[PDB]
């Protein structure tokens with residue numbers, strides 16, 4: 001390798017977005033600033049389209065890359081990337097939830113985002129602390145049944161019930177009213193940061209953020225959900241964080257994304273760093289770590305590939321083995337992978353919203 | 368000077384589902400009606416897919432667009448390729464007529480591009496739920512061929528989630544459901560729902576039968592709409608309870624000839640196997656041709672419909688396509704698969720499914736599910 005080139009597919013907006021582009025640039029600058037220079041070629045996705053993602057992959061492969069990162073928030077498209085990466089034997093580095101299918105693509109990818117099973121287990125751990133009550137689940141879309149499959153199977157067998165409602169409309173109010181009528185305390189919200197905020201804002205207006213109710217959010221952007229006027233002194237609103245605020249680069253990461261936001265986005269208030277930005281940063285380090293390790297025992301070369309040819313990257317299988325041996329301390333905590341390419345030996349901090357922000361009330365361990 | 372549509376097939380030439388023949392039968396029937404003045408002749412250009420791949424499917428669409436078509440039909444059994452066709456049809460504003468199960472999860476931006484003659488997931492779930500009602504709402508086991516069955520059967524799953532009855536879910540490992548079936552056997556729950564295609568459903572029932580699990584205790588409900596072609600000779604006994612659905616209207620005036628024509632083809636070209644009866648996808652393809660012709664002739668009674676070559680690499684759209692979608696969604700047609708009508712989302716509406724039980728003599732009709740009731 002003359003340069004250590006990888007590609008990143010971004011579905012992030014440039015203005016008032018999650019700062020994934022800057023996070024990639026920060027990782028690159030940090031690694032290079034410390035041989036072959038690291039390059040990250042960035043490709044934009046306008047929407048979640050498998051057909052258009054295929055066109056993007058056909059542009060990427062001829063550039064000679066060692067991995068493809070993302071996208072973080074376009075599940076159909078990410079499944080297409082995994083498929084094509086698998087056929088070409090180029091590693092796919094995932095940084096968002098799979099929503100949520102594929103047995104045959106077992107060795108196409110690794111993912112830095114918590115597995116669906118782990119999120120299900122983490123929510124179930126909280127339900128255990130509640131003495132396993134019946135609950136309601138509010139989903140942005142019906143695919144939540146796939147991502148929370150393990151939780152759903154548990155409720156399908158238990159004595160406790162789970163009432164599921166989909167937003168699929170832009171006002172949760174009527175849905176919350178039905179929950180209130182049911183007189184069930186525990187409400188699980190499965191949605192991204194902005195919809196989660198919308199649901200809680202409307203619950204607040206209906207007086208449903210009082211002490212009677214207990215909310216569990218699945219979004220890993222819980223830390224950047226700022227809930228003033230929504231969160232009451234008596235609220236029980238719990239969620240998760242992957243961030244290791246003790247990682248040496250954490251303050252610099254926060255400040256850099258803050259400055260970028262202040263400069264380009266005057267219409268909204270910077271809430272703090274999005275997890276997908278931190279995952280992108282960590283993904284660059286994971287790829288570089290594995291490639292440099294592989295490069296110690298054998299000769300790596302990159303080659304232009306065509307998406308429609310039968311040709312593969314001869315070194316891809318080996319790189320995937322080295323990726324799955326990586327042990328890395330990142331912004332999102334310890335990064336190690338199991339034989340499915342899922343994060344293992346990591347933690348999720350369990351946070352509760354308070355007046356001033358949030359406080360840590362516990363830790364979930366993947367092991 | 369003609370009303371030309373294209374059909375994309377993933378079906379074998381011989382010993383297959385008979386889709387190519389069904390398309391020719393629809394065209395012959397429509398062109399055979401005597402009208403004065405003589406109306407435009409119907410043509411169906413047929414393209415075969417050697418595989419379920421965006422690359423091949425895109426190439427096929429690129430061959431189709433310059434031919435000047437008013438709609439593209441199928442493929443029936445390749446959801447990934449069907450989604451590729453929807454994408455390209457949608458960009459060029461040519462209606463896509465779907466005749467197989469929807470991709471699950473659905474790609475939202477492509478919903479507008481098609482109408483579908485195959486029952487929605489919601490409808491399949493409701494029909495299964497209707498059978499469960501007749502068993503007095505029992506606990507059940509669900510056997511899934513694909514990880515997406517919980518989404519396909521969302522209504523049914525949400526129902527079990529608030530019910531006092533339980534649902535155990537087991538996914539098949541991409542060629543022996545035996546271990547899975549032994550687990551169900553130990554649970555001592557009678558009702559087993561199988562969500563799988565025809566060949567995998569047959570495999571599950573065969574392995575169940577080899578475990579002695581097709582005796583009277585067990586009650587099976589199959590989601591496959593090809594239930595009628597499932598031949599379980601040596602698997603089903605008088606005492607078995609194996610239930611499923613049929614879309615076919617055997618009282619449609621062309622039904623006997625449709626079946627005989629597909630049979631004759633089979634007894635000409637497949638001296639090995641025994642003709643199992645008509646595949647649903649073949650009947651859906653037949654009905655799809657009628658639906659397209661009906662909508663196009665109605666659109667054409669006010670506007671002069673022109674058809675020019677388009678191309679994959681050109682941004683040109685067919686100027687009548689978006690309007691044709693409105694007419695397609697308003698078609699009412701009595702077909703081989705029953706009443707064909709659509710709701711505003713392009714899904715089948717106002718139709719029925721027959722509820723059948725397998726017997727040694729084939730199967731027996733035991734009820735009806737009404738989509739509206």
Ligand SMILES: *[C@@H]1O[C@H](CO)[C@@H](O[C@@H]2O[C@H](CO)[C@@H](O)[C@H](O)[C@H]2NC(C)=O)[C@H](O)[C@H]1NC(C)=O
Pocket residue numbers: 073140141167168169170192193194195
């Ligand atoms: C969070 O998820 C919501 C709900 O799925 C997304 O909101 C949709 O966005 C599309 C495209 O902008 C709109 O056409 C829909 O009207 C929205 N639905 C609803 C219910 O609001 C939203 O895109 C996601 N937020 C982010 C930042 O990714």
Ligand SMILES: *[C@@H]1O[C@H](CO)[C@@H](O[C@@H]2O[C@H](CO)[C@@H](O)[C@H](O)[C@H]2NC(C)=O)[C@H](O)[C@H]1NC(C)=O
Pocket residue numbers: 444512541542564565566567
């Ligand atoms: C019914 O489903 C099964 C798989 O779910 C299909 O069988 C597949 O056939 C091809 C060719 O051998 C392979 O890609 C898969 O490995 C097979 N799976 C299994 C388990 O056999 C079968 O083709 C489907 N039938 C139709 C017409 O859709």
Ligand SMILES: *[C@@H]1O[C@H](CO)[C@@H](O)[C@H](O)[C@H]1NC(C)=O
Pocket residue numbers: 001004035036291292295296
């Ligand atoms: C691979 O090894 C060679 C020799 O040690 C070195 O020149 C090259 O920069 C290495 N590549 C990377 C990415 O470290």
Ligand SMILES: *[C@@H]1O[C@H](CO)[C@@H](O)[C@H](O)[C@H]1NC(C)=O
Pocket residue numbers: 254258270271272
């Ligand atoms: C952004 O930076 C400013 C200036 O230091 C600070 O006041 C603000 O709180 C920062 N935002 C976050 C969320 O850290």
Ligand SMILES: *[C@@H]1O[C@H](CO)[C@@H](O)[C@H](O)[C@H]1NC(C)=O
Pocket residue numbers: 244245246247248329333334347
């Ligand atoms: C966070 O980073 C610090 C500093 O490197 C490290 O000591 C600690 O183990 C990390 N914590 C977690 C939860 O990974």
Ligand SMILES: *[C@@H]1O[C@H](CO)[C@@H](O)[C@H](O)[C@H]1NC(C)=O
Pocket residue numbers: 334345
């Ligand atoms: C898990 O990660 C920690 C760092 O957070 C590391 O010290 C430890 O060796 C790992 N434990 C196991 C069992 O792999």
Ligand SMILES: *[C@@H]1O[C@H](CO)[C@@H](O)[C@H](O)[C@H]1NC(C)=O
Pocket residue numbers: 369370405406407663664667668671672
């Ligand atoms: C449209 O109507 C005109 C007038 O009868 C006729 O020439 C033509 O056959 C029709 N076109 C189609 C495709 O039905």
Ligand SMILES: *[C@@H]1O[C@H](CO)[C@@H](O)[C@H](O)[C@H]1NC(C)=O
Pocket residue numbers: 626627630631634642643644
């Ligand atoms: C197919 O043809 C055979 C031989 O002519 C006939 O006996 C049989 O009834 C037909 N099968 C069906 C399902 O119509």
Ligand SMILES: *[C@@H]1O[C@H](CO)[C@@H](O)[C@H](O)[C@H]1NC(C)=O
Pocket residue numbers: 616617618619620701704705706719
């Ligand atoms: C079946 O076809 C007959 C004859 O055209 C028709 O009267 C009847 O309504 C149809 N039944 C269904 C269920 O569509």
Ligand SMILES: *[C@@H]1O[C@H](CO)[C@@H](O)[C@H](O)[C@H]1NC(C)=O
Pocket residue numbers: 706717
């Ligand atoms: C639904 O279909 C039936 C049976 O073919 C038909 O007679 C009727 O007009 C339709 N009903 C409604 C409410 O449109």
Ligand code: NA
Pocket residue numbers: 155156157158159160161162527528530
């Ligand atoms: Na339950």
Ligand code: NA
Pocket residue numbers: 155156157527528529530531532533534
């Ligand atoms: Na239940």
